[PDB]
Amino acid sequence: HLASADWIEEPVRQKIALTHKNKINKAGELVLTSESSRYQFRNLAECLQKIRDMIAEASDARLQRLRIEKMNRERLRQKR
Amino acid sequence: ERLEKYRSFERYRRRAEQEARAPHWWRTYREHFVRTQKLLERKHFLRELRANVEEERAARLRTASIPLEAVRAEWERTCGPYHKQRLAEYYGLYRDLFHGATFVPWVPLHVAYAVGEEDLIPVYHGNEVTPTEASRAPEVTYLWTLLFINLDGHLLEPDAEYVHWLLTNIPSNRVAEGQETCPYLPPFPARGSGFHRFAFLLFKQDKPINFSEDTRPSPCYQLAQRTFRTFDFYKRHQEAMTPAGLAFFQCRWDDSVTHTFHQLLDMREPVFEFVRLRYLDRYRDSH
């Protein structure tokens, strides 16, 4: 669980969530899987390395368009 | 000079696009991926308009203007029904509702959702109205039969659809006299399914027919009994039903949708989203 996890400092937690929000499960847990080798520990080791990279690396237009289309809808909403 | 030269690029582009539309021996994208008296009276007015110096003065002064409202009413009367069919067909209502049967509408059906009492939200063809704005039954202005559908609002079966409210034996324009076969239900579009198209159908009634089969308990909050098919229902009544009016809007998910699913539908909110050495030397690259 990225947000609840207190070992990660709060500034890093937000930055990790923004960059890797796609990897956060519906439960809120951050799920990462590679399985790039036939050895489980190497697969785990690859997972471990990514976390270290994620920790180190971590350490709106959409809203405007919705207003524009909503404004267009209101003007488009004229048959009274 | 012998070869013809289009004096604008777009003319070639439009001609090429028109050329591409027709099939050709050479490969193209599409193949792989695919009364009189009234007019004479009208013309007399046009000559008068041209003669008017004031209109000419505005044109040279580039200050002339036109009233949109006046044009809109005239357009509906003249060729509005034909454009009405295009929107319905483009959205796939005919294929989904009548299994491909196409009808030119003749009654200029118009619907709007009453916002309290001050104003009423229009329902255009292809309109966008939020489910929060559909908590109430809409006003319809145009015997007769009036029917409501959520074409893609069904949550379990693709072909099936649900009725919002169905009125039968509508006399002339007044709709309060129609039999309330189906009680009104607010829209309940599933989250993550985007825009659901709801079509409002008006059918000419040659003779009054009691649709006891289509009568539903009032109030009814069961989806199992709301499910129906337009095609078979229309086929059963195709003899006395000829569609002439249309009105349809698109709705997204909204906070009211949660209320509709829980308060009266009394079920969980539906959520969906489209999803886009020796022994080991042989296994590894090294060997």
Next chain:
Amino acid sequence: KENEAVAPEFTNRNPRNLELLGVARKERGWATVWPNREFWHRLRVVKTQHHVEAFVEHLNGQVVVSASTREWAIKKHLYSTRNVVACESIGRVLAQRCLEAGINFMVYQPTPWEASSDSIKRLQNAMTESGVMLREPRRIY
């Protein structure tokens, strides 16, 4: 509660469900031809010798909104079918028809000479004030 049962997958059939959502595919081919095809709808403006017409066409090639000065309603209130104001009026009429059709977004690709035309610029000014967007939303991958 029996009602609580919900199907695993939806059965949305609306043709514009993905297009309105933004997930629908945009033409990414025609790399050897100009201009880009990454538009769901396009504005086609055709000025004839005596009439000015503006159309909005979807990728499938079916015009959904068609505005023409030859139409009786507009012309009776329009002094001369060919004029700068006519382009403004047809733009507002096309917008109103765009308002009628429910289409809010379209891609316009004026030519160098057409773009320089004041009538087309005023027509675009009519479109922007009416809310019709000359730029469509980007597709969602």
